Design an enzyme around this catalytic site. Structure first.
Site, PDB file in Angstrom:
ATOM      1  N   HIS A  41      25.972   6.857  88.453  1.00 53.66           N
ATOM      2  CA  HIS A  41      27.013   7.570  89.282  1.00 53.66           C
ATOM      3  C   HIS A  41      27.383   8.878  88.653  1.00 53.66           C
ATOM      4  O   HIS A  41      27.905   9.788  89.330  1.00 53.66           O
ATOM      5  CB  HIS A  41      28.258   6.688  89.565  1.00 53.66           C
ATOM      6  CG  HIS A  41      29.205   6.535  88.413  1.00 53.66           C
ATOM      7  ND1 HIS A  41      29.132   5.486  87.521  1.00 53.66           N
ATOM      8  CD2 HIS A  41      30.317   7.354  87.992  1.00 53.66           C
ATOM      9  CE1 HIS A  41      30.119   5.613  86.578  1.00 53.66           C
ATOM     10  NE2 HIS A  41      30.846   6.746  86.865  1.00 53.66           N
ATOM     11  N   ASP A  90      26.080  -0.969  92.665  1.00 52.05           N
ATOM     12  CA  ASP A  90      25.154  -1.891  92.029  1.00 52.05           C
ATOM     13  C   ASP A  90      24.005  -1.096  91.368  1.00 52.05           C
ATOM     14  O   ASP A  90      23.555  -0.090  91.926  1.00 52.05           O
ATOM     15  CB  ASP A  90      24.574  -2.789  93.138  1.00 52.05           C
ATOM     16  CG  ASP A  90      23.951  -4.105  92.586  1.00 52.05           C
ATOM     17  OD1 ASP A  90      23.240  -4.800  93.389  1.00 52.05           O
ATOM     18  OD2 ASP A  90      24.172  -4.501  91.412  1.00 52.05           O
ATOM     19  N   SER A 187      32.418   6.713  81.398  1.00 56.01           N
ATOM     20  CA  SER A 187      31.323   6.156  82.146  1.00 56.01           C
ATOM     21  C   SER A 187      29.992   6.588  81.551  1.00 56.01           C
ATOM     22  O   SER A 187      29.890   7.700  81.008  1.00 56.01           O
ATOM     23  CB  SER A 187      31.433   6.561  83.628  1.00 56.01           C
ATOM     24  OG  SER A 187      32.138   5.560  84.320  1.00 56.01           O
ATOM     25  N   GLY A 188      29.005   5.698  81.553  1.00 56.38           N
ATOM     26  CA  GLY A 188      27.690   6.142  80.992  1.00 56.38           C
ATOM     27  C   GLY A 188      27.579   5.699  79.528  1.00 56.38           C
ATOM     28  O   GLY A 188      26.430   5.506  79.065  1.00 56.38           O
TER      29      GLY A 188
END
Length: 235
Positions: A41, A90, A187-188
């Site tokens: 994302h 997902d 994130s990540g």
């Protein structure tokens, strides 16, 4: 990272900060001398001019501008997971190639992918680290933050997150009482778990509802589900 504390230099030498338009937007994990694992994302829809992304490896404090151990690398290829579903969150995982390889040091090292059939058991503490927000809707860290969080079973995570589809491709972690969690800008980054004196990349920071709420765990992409695909890129 909410409820964590400053990491020491060298603490997590696979942790990498990802910059786009001069802002550290996401974390990532070094898995070889020229590949990172991060979250789809983070790069989805903005990955096709990959040179707009810069990785800084060996990073500790964003404001330390005379650091001899940090090394920058342009990114020259970004591959999102072919099953990634943005709406459902997902398969939220991506590979990013370093334009040139890195030499490993005490500050720059790859993290192992899970062993075949490795179990990361619910209840076990794993660690997270990142430069994202220190409180929900707060501000980004300067010094890398770390925290330890216990794994949940997917059954328990799905009961706590009924608004979301918690799949076999996700692994969840957080405390019943809340207080300690990944947050925006993390994130990540890695969820990493120790076994037999070695660290494994168990998950990639993906999503959650707000951050650090009681009975609302962080959700991570479950790396064991992607080990074959991640391996497909490697030298």
């Amino acid at each position: 990272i909410v409820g964590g504390s400053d990491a020491k230099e060298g603490a997590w030498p696979w942790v990498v900060g990802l910059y786009y338009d001069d802002r550290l937007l996401c974390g990532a994990s070094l898995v070889s001398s020229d590949w990172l694992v991060s979250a789809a994302h983070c790069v989805y829809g903005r990955n096709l001019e990959p040179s707009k992304w810069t990785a800084i490896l060996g990073l500790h404090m964003k404001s330390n501008l005379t650091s001899p151990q940090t090394v920058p690398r342009l990114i020259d290829e970004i591959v999102i997971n072919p099953h990634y579903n943005r709406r459902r969150k997902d398969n939220d995982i991506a590979m990013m190639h370093l334009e040139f390889k890195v030499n490993y040091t005490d500050y720059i090292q790859p993290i192992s992918l899970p062993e075949e059939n490795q179990v990361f058991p619910p209840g076990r503490n794993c660690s997270i680290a990142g430069w994202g927000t220190v409180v929900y809707q707060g501000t980004t860290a300067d010094i890398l933050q770390e925290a330890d969080v216990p794994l949940l079973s997917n059954e328990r995570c799905q009961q706590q997150m009924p608004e979301y589809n918690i799949t076999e491709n996700m692994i969840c972690a957080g405390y019943e009482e809340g207080g300690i969690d990944s947050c925006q800008g993390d994130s990540g980054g890695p969820l990493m778990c120790q076994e037999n004196n070695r660290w494994f990349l168990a998950g990639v920071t993906s999503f959650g509802y707000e951050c650090a709420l009681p009975n609302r765990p962080g959700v991570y992409a479950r790396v064991s589900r992607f080990t074959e695909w991640i391996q497909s890129f490697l030298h």
